[PDB]
Design a binder for this molecule. Structure first.
Ligand SMILES: CC(=O)N[C@H]1[C@@H](OP(=O)(O)OP(=O)(O)OC/C=C(/C)CC/C=C(/C)CC/C=C(/C)CCC=C(C)C)O[C@H](CO)[C@@H](O)[C@@H]1O
Ligand SMILES: [Mn+2]
Ligand SMILES: [Mn+2]
Ligand code: NA
Lengths: 706, 8
């Protein structure tokens, strides 16, 4: 069974068997987390596991609303979006529950990446090495992360489509396949329809396909024709204009041998560049670069048309930076395999010039080093082929150096090499015991909110929670996973981190002015608030918000809920930082002392962050420095508001909070202690003239304005 | 790691 020769085999039957083996491997491998997570009651809702990224709930809401057939005007529902639409088709066609579909779609489609990997490897007559490369590429660390079961997001096809476009270019370079004239464009359309940001990659790849053609095929008409078709496919023409052009030029080139004169096709290239230009061309690329590569704060380019706001970019986990070890493991699950993968890619390049067309994705992935870990994805499959090529290279050496190796033994050697180098990805999967977005309890709290509040109501929360609340509670939010600029975040920051009188004034004013801005398009909503109540600056208006005798000339059009969950505690300083920023200034106002940590054991308490709590319960020890406490607040009931305020030092400024119900400690300053969050959630102290308590739980509180 | 959520 093993003595036979697999390397030379490139048959369609063999490649189909290999695709099936690798696809089944990819699915099976992302089934372990389902097996693990299913044993915890905390992860279920409606008899199924929950989604596993915040953003999935955005498409999940959208899918739900397409199924229901409507949404409300100006909830920012992903109604009609691509992943919502594919979810809706599959839901209407299949017998499985909605939650199961949303759980498993990524597990299926991300595994399709196995197809183009080993078909590209096969175009070079390396199908078996393609098979190994597809195994590695399908479960490599960062790719797995954003496509595991429950990662119900757009990442699940975001390399499959570009890899199929690459395969398309390869087949054109090797066989001059006329069917490329059709597939290259169609795939770009699908990619552009599935992930509009894909524009940038498409623009780069198409661009390179031109330069490559100016070099290696400077005379072949089919390359110029397919370039014109692809640039058209990049444009904003209606789908029928695009497809009409594509099919027209395709038939005319396919069935005419007198064909299309060369001047005509250069004319087509010009018409194309004009059309794509009218469609906005290259601007989306410079914008995305502006946000991720240049990390600008004011990205909409409004000097004095807006106020100045804290920059959310340095706040999102996806966009956080990464050191070289982690970059390499994200890409290859291991430094060794990464080095060998890179060598393999060089050798593959300096053997198949066409693999040059993979450079955009490679470049995009490496761009992670500047633009955040979320980009390494783009380098996984390219680099995986590189590793495949390295293996082909290695055994090639072993024959060009006449090494005496049986077939059975060379095959045992290959299986061993591939298994030993694919191990790190499996380890990562095993350890990547990710958990649900929320707990059953929070999804339950928000669904009960659904049955309590109205569809046209707002809940003020932090933007992290915008998608899950809108999914579970079917309400409106101020900010969410895709609407979370400084200018957007300011209102929720203020409501949650300032005192209650102005927090409620701001909750009413912000919800009302957001609703108005749907009809009025304020470039800055805070600026609209200011320039309505006849104030001179942001600080001026916000400080005028402090008056218990405040006139409210904006009428009430809905209820305004405030969602205050326990899990926000640990990011309270980050939330607070947004309203800590003088909008007239961009300047930080107070210093913000905060951290939450767990006691270790039970004589001097140490806490995770090295902060020693005094035996006295009267001082802390940060970085060798002992700092006095103003008070030790020992909180036994978050819901009852039963707590014990122990005075220590009227002259000091730091508070220590003990959460018995969580066995956790909080270290904060005076400014944060009085925030709406710490008071209404932890201590259960709220002005009953300003809010009504709607839900009171140890894990979350929901209040309503009045 | 790969979440469109807050950290810090
Ligand atoms: C449900 C939900 O809310 N989802 C939200 C989430 O989703 P998202 O990540 O998918 O959207 P995105 O952040 O804009 O994607 C940009 C990621 C790219 C890889 C594409 C473009 C990035 C570049 C850096 C351009 C690079 C240019 C090239 C030409 C490639 C070649 C480069 C080389 C060679 C160096 O984030 C959004 C935040 O606003 C929201 O809108 C969206 O709603
Ligand atoms: Mn996402
Ligand atoms: Mn709705
Ligand atoms: Na349990």
């Amino acid at each position: 069974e093993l003595q036979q020769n697999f390397t030379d085999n490139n048959s369609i039957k063999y490649t189909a068997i290999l695709i099936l083996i690798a696809f089944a491997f990819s699915v099976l491998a992302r089934l372990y987390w389902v097996a693990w997570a299913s044993e915890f009651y905390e992860f279920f809702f409606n008899d199924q596991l929950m989604i596993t990224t915040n953003d999935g709930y955005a498409f999940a809401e959208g899918a739900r609303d397409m199924i229901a057939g409507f949404h409300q005007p100006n909830d920012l529902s992903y109604f009609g979006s691509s992943l919502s639409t594919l979810t809706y088709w599959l839901y209407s066609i299949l017998p499985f529950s909605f939650e199961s579909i949303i759980l498993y779609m990524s597990t299926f489609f991300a595994s399709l990446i196995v197809v183009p990997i080993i078909l590209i490897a096969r175009e070079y007559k390396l199908t078996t090495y393609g098979f190994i490369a597809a195994l590695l590429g399908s479960i490599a660390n960062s790719y797995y992360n954003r496509t595991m079961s429950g990662y119900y997001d757009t990442d699940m096809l975001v390399l499959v489509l570009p890899m199929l476009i690459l395969l398309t270019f390869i087949r054109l370079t090797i066989n001059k396949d006329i069917f490329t004239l059709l597939l290259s464009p169609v795939f770009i359309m699908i990619y552009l329809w599935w992930y509009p940001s894909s524009y940038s990659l498409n623009f780069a790849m198409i661009g390179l396909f031109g330069l490559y053609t100016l070099v290696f095929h400077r005379k072949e008409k089919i390359f110029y024709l397919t370039i014109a078709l692809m640039i058209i496919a990049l444009s904003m023409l209606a789908w029928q204009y695009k497809l009409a052009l594509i099919v027209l030029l395709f038939a005319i080139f396919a069935f005419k041998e007198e064909k299309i004169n060369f001047y005509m096709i250069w004319a087509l290239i010009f018409i194309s560049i004009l059309i794509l230009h009218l469609s906005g061309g290259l601007d989306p690329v410079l914008y995305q670069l502006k946000f991720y590569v240049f990390k600008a704060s004011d990205v909409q380019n409004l000097k004095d048309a807006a106020f100045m706001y804290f920059n959310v970019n340095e706040t999102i986990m996806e966009v956080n930076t990464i050191d070289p070890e982690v970059f390499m493991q994200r890409i290859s699950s291991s430094v060794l395999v990464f080095i060998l993968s890179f060598i393999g890619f060089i050798l593959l390049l300096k053997d198949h010039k066409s693999m040059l067309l993979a450079l955009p994705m490679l470049a995009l992935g490496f761009m992670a080093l500047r633009a955040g870990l979320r980009f390494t994805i783009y380098a996984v499959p390219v680099m995986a082929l590189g590793f495949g090529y390295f293996l082909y290279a290695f055994f090639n050496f072993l024959e060009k150096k006449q090494i005496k190796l049986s077939l059975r033994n060379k095959n045992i050697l290959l299986i061993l090499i591939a298994f030993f180098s694919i191990s790190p990805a499996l380890m990562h999967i095993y350890y990547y015991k990710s958990s649900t977005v929320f707990t059953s309890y929070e999804a339950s709290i928000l669904n009960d909110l659904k049955n309590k509040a109205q569809r046209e109501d707002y809940v003020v929360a932090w933007w992290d929670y915008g998608y899950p609340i809108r999914y579970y509670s079917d309400v409106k939010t101020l900010i969410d996973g895709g609407k979370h600029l400084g200018k957007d975040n300011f209102f929720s920051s203020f409501v949650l981190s300032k005192e209650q009188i102005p927090a409620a004034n701001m909750a009413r004013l912000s919800v009302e002015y957001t609703e108005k801005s749907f009809k009025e398009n304020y470039p800055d909503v805070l600026k609209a608030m200011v320039k309505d109540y006849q104030k001179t600056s942001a600080k001026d208006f916000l400080e005028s918000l402090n008056d218990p005798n405040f006139k409210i000339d904006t009428p009430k059009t809905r209820d305004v809920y405030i969602y205050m969950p326990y899990r926000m505690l640990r990011i309270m300083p980050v939330v607070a930082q947004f309203a800590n920023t003088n909008p007239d200034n961009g300047e930080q106002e107070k210093s913000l002392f905060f951290s939450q940590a767990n006691p270790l054991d039970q004589g001097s308490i140490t806490l995770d962050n090295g902060v020693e709590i005094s035996n006295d319960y009267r001082s802390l020890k940060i970085e060798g420095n002992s700092i006095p406490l103003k008070a030790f607040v020992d909180i036994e009931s978050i819901t009852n508001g039963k707590f014990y305020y122990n005075e220590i030092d009227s002259k000091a400024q730091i508070y220590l909070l003990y959460l018995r119900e969580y066995k956790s400690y909080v270290i904060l300053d005076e400014s944060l202690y009085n925030s709406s969050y710490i008071q209404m959630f932890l201590l259960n102290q709220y002005d009953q003239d300003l809010f009504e308590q709607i839900t009171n739980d140890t894990r979350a509180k929901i209040y309503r304005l009045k | 790691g790969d979440q469109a959520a807050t950290f810090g």
